[PDB]
Design a binder for this molecule. Structure first.
Ligand SMILES: Nc1ncnc2c1ncn2[C@@H]1O[C@H](COP(=O)(O)OP(=O)(O)OP(=O)(O)O)[C@@H](O)[C@H]1O
Ligand SMILES: CC(C)c1ccccc1-c1ccc(C[NH3+])cc1Cl
Length: 325
């Protein structure tokens, strides 16, 4: 069978805490008063959620209400417990309240409001220092949730809210987040296609916090090279081929051999043979203002097939790319 693996950092943080911390199924959810909130307008619509701007009538504070389609109760309990555990963490979205709709029995999470601006609109005003600054803010959030024995498992631009005016960043959407337990085999059907790590794509279940560091690398690559998404797969199999076209096929086969992974037969038909590309090959006149040798060295240390070989969030914080922050 596959070779076992464990996180290089925060390995046993959940083993040493009482069951109450990580046993989300036993968590008792208590509802606030839905009448304390007046819906203003629709902001977005997720996979299993509708998002509204609202105001807390009791204190005239603007909030965001995430109305959840109750498809899986266990999943709701998991998101709530994690948000409760991480509440007050650096750059972690604050869960302010949990409420229910009496008539339709619909649960809703209430969050602090963030005056967000999308990636496409943000890029034009972003300087090299700004990317270093915000990347460091994401790292503080990841080092914090990893230290708390939690893997985010859905790191992507749509899950990072940025109020550029106030230079305020918040890591959101903890619906796919999970507690890390060494030796545990997790569901690989997590993260969004473009950000899925190689461990997910080759069905290696014993993954850890390093999954988020791959997703962070995908984000950095799309910014510094202005290629969104960086690895543009059309399905989960094709996603690995797009990674192999950059990282080369040699290091991929070294990875599957190292962990004794049984690669799906479909890959022989589509994977092929690819050289390992130099990161400098993606530099052009439109994107060169956000590229530096430090940026490329840093990217090289995140975007590695071997999940054990990627920088942890704390190691990433110590990289020369962030000496200016
Ligand atoms: N605090 C917030 N401020 C603004 N939009 C938010 C906030 N929290 C979640 N969202 C939006 O709702 C969705 C959350 O999942 C995303 O589409 C995101 O844009
Ligand atoms: C600077 C920032 C951390 C970043 C780096 C790499 C890729 C994208 C982004 C990014 C993330 C979220 C949002 C707002 N939803 C906007 C942007 Cl520009």
């Amino acid at each position: 069978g596959p070779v076992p693996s464990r996180a290089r950092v925060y390995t046993d943080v959940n083993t040493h805490r009482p069951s109450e911390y990580w046993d989300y199924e036993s968590h008792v959810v208590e509802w606030g008063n839905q009448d304390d909130y007046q819906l203003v307008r629709k902001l977005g619509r997720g996979k299993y959620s509708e998002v509204f701007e609202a105001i807390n009538i009791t204190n005239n504070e603007k909030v965001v209400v995430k109305i959840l389609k109750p498809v899986k109760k266990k999943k709701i309990k998991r998101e709530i417990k994690i948000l409760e555990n991480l509440r007050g963490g650096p750059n972690i979205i604050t869960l302010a309240d949990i409420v229910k709709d009496p008539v339709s029995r619909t649960p809703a999470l209430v969050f602090e409001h963030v005056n967000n601006t999308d990636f496409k609109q943000l890029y034009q005003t972003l300087t090299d220092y700004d990317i270093r600054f915000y990347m460091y803010e994401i790292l503080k959030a990841l080092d914090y949730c990893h230290s708390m024995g939690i893997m985010h498992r859905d790191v992507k631009p749509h899950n990072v809210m940025i109020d550029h005016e106030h230079r305020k960043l918040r890591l959101i959407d903890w619906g796919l987040a999970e507690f890390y337990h060494p030796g545990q085999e997790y569901n690989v059907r997590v993260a969004s296609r473009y950000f899925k790590g190689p461990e997910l794509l080759v069905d290696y279940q014993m993954y850890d916090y390093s999954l988020d560091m791959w997703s962070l690398g995908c984000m950095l690559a799309s910014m510094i090279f202005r290629k969104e998404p960086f690895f543009h797969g059309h399905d989960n199999y094709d996603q690995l081929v797009r990674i192999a076209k950059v990282l080369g096929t040699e290091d991929l086969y070294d990875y599957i051999d190292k962990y004794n992974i049984e690669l799906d037969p479909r890959f022989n038909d589509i994977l092929g043979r690819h050289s390992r590309k130099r990161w400098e090959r993606f530099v052009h006149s439109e994107n060169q203002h956000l590229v530096s040798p430090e940026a490329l060295d840093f990217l090289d240390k995140l975007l590695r097939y071997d999940h054990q070989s990627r920088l942890t969030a704390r190691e990433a914080m110590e990289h020369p790319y962030f000496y200016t922050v």
